Amino acid sequence: LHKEPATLIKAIDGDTVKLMYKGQPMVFRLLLVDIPETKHPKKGVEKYGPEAAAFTKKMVENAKKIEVEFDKGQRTDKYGRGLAYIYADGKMVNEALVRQGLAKVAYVYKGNNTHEQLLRKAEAQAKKEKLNIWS
Template sequence: MKLKDIKTLITSGTIILAVGLYLVFAKPTDEQPPTNDGAQNNIVSQEQKHYSITPELAMNETGKQLIDVEFIAANDGDTMSVKMDGQKQRVRLLMIDTPEMNYDKGDPMPYAEAAKQLTTQLLEDAKSVQLLFDKGPETDKYDRLLAYVFVDGVSLHEVLLNEGLAAVRYVNKPNNSLEDELREIQQQAEAKKLNIWAYPNYLQRDGFHPEEVNK
């Protein structure tokens, strides 16, 4: 091998070694790849969270069994239509309230659409939707089923409260077996000032007051 070729080989090997050492020992950059912060990413994957109201806890507290249903559509965050035993039924979530859609006025309350979107997305994507009745009446004066709803084993009540899109309201014994658990979850959202809790006077004793958000 000629001397010129040997020098070229040594030079190339040195360059390759330098690049390799740089890749191994170079400090990682602080820059992060850009992320998509669009609305579709506003809802955190529910599978990544820990939930306190399990189906087992709920069944134990109520003394009732879960009933499989088929989701049809959501009217708002706390009301929906399902098919149960082949019949279409309207369901009202026990003990929680979300802002009203106000279909008659065409003017949804603040966060009403977000609550409906979350409920709809979870129920549409679910492999399993189940209802659980409490110890009291199973229907209200509007002939709606009063129930807890579980989506793939996760409490829809807990998800809405966790996201600050619902509040504990309309508590009537003995349909209040999970009241303490729901209030504790709500307190955490309040402390973080999430969504409806970002405005101190949005929710008052008589319900939601949109004017407090629009000030």
């Protein structure tokens, strides 16, 4: 897996960020996390959703360097969002969110599972520390 530079354009939600990637604007969906939604079609804002969105937002807004890492499965979803691991100054946003108990590890979609175990480990730790959604 290769990390590629991107530039933040706008954070949209806990699980979705808009980046300039290889010259064009593009929306990315964070791989392997199920985050309380804030822009949830149905149910709307959820418990911890605003907190997950603020966290994601703060992490990418204060980063000097944003990198995107595609996995080896399918690279876009049906809505045209890129499916990737996002790095803020070398720290993986996907992992941060789970470790902080602000998201759960989602099912593995279309062969995109390279960091699945890394994330399930983070999620066990947050579960043991009764963090936020595991409060």
